Design a protein around this ligand. Structure first.
Ligand SMILES: CCCCCCCC/C=C/CCCCCCCCOC(=O)[C@H](O)CO
Ligand SMILES: CCCCCCCC/C=C\CCCCCCCCOC(=O)[C@H](O)CO
Ligand SMILES: CCCCCCCC/C=C\CCCCCCCCOC(=O)[C@H](O)CO
Ligand code: DMA
Ligand code: DMA
Ligand SMILES: [Mg+2]
Length: 280
């Protein structure tokens, strides 16, 4: 049972879940202004943990045949865990997450249910269909924060963080798809750069631009101060510059570089929200 527990932790991808759970705490810290309550923290950490665990397991169930070719070392294609054992496990992880979220509030259950439907549908069909998949990737990453946010007293700064993450991650996903265009085409993957070419990069720019318009709101609404405003300013200008370069040079090389830059900037924006939250 020492080896079996290691196999079940490999199936859920325990590192990815803890990463998502920390994201959920981050959101709760901002919302409560670091005035953290241990009982609410334990609910937030584990609801995100089990909803994330369910998603990773449901992903492996629908990918058992695909994984048999690419990376057969995974728990399901290697035969370490039976398909039925995985299906019963994902059901248990799901009930745990949903029942636990009832003890937070109505908003937490709504996010829990919406995440659960998106995770199942993404694993089932929207992983291959990027126009909807790119939205899902954006929404789910942002929802992690919003989940911790709805548990705290001031959700407004976490609402802006969720909206900005969704828009910028969705945009960056189309940018990644423009770089992976040649590979995706010879795999039966439908994406905006495959259907529209360079035109899609204007929609990726639009999503980044809309995120930039919403970014000074915690300052304007008198929630966050000067350090947020300065960190956001550098990042907003760098975002508009990054997309401007890609629109001027719409190639695989530039798309690859802009994709790396946007990930760094997104991490500084997260730091700016944490820094802004330190109001004590
Ligand atoms: C990351 C790069 C950006 C550069 C950082 C810019 C931040 C500037 C912040 C200004 C506020 C000053 C806080 C320091 C108070 C310490 C002296 C207070 O005196 C003391 O040490 C007392 O004994 C404490 O009780
Ligand atoms: C591989 C080393 C890991 C050891 C973990 C350290 C434990 C420290 C804290 C308490 C353990 C959790 C509570 C016990 C749950 C089930 C006990 C019921 O007992 C058992 O699980 C059976 O005795 C197993 O045969
Ligand atoms: C590859 C992506 C990495 C970029 C991320 C930028 C982080 C933005 C946050 C603020 C940095 C604080 C400024 C202090 C550095 C000194 C300026 C020295 O800098 C300058 O004046 C010239 O830029 C030097 O060439
Ligand atoms: C960030 C994101 C899009 C979450 C979906 O989880 P997944 O099951 O697709 O993730 P992974 O491929 O890491 O198992
Ligand atoms: C404001 C903002 C975009 C938040 C941070 O996102 P992240 O660090 O989770 O981004 P990713 O992991 O998708 O690069
Ligand atoms: Mg991502």
């Amino acid at each position: 049972f020492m080896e079996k527990l290691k196999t079940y932790l490999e199936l859920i991808r325990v590192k990815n879940c803890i990463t998502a759970s920390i994201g959920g705490i981050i959101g709760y810290l901002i919302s409560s202004n670091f005035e953290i309550d241990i009982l609410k923290s334990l609910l937030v950490f584990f609801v995100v943990f089990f909803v994330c665990a369910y998603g990773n397991v449901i992903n492996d169930i629908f990918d058992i045949e695909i994984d048999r070719i690419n990376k057969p070392s995974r728990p399901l294609p290697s035969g370490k865990i039976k398909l039925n054992e995985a299906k019963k496990f994902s059901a248990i992880l799901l009930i745990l997450g949903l029942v636990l979220s009832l003890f937070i509030n109505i908003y937490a259950l709504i996010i829990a249910v919406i995440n659960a439907l998106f995770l199942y549908l993404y694993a089932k069909k929207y992983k291959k269909y990027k126009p909807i998949g790119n939205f899902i990737i954006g929404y789910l990453t942002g929802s992690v924060f919003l989940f911790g946010g709805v548990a705290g007293k001031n959700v407004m700064p976490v609402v802006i963080l969720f909206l900005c993450s969704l828009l910028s991650i969705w945009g960056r996903e189309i940018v990644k798809d423009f770089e992976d265009m040649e590979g995706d085409k010879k795999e039966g993957v439908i994406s905006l750069p495959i259907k529209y070419g360079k035109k899609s990069l204007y929609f990726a720019t639009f999503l980044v631009v809309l995120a930039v318009i919403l970014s000074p709101l915690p300052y304007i609404l008198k929630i966050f101060g000067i350090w947020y405003l300065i960190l956001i300013a550098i990042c907003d200008i760098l975002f508009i510059y990054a997309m401007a370069l890609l629109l001027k040079e719409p190639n695989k090389e530039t798309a690859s570089k802009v994709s790396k830059f946007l990930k760094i900037i997104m991490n500084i924006v997260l730091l700016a929200f944490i820094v802004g939250a330190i109001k004590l």
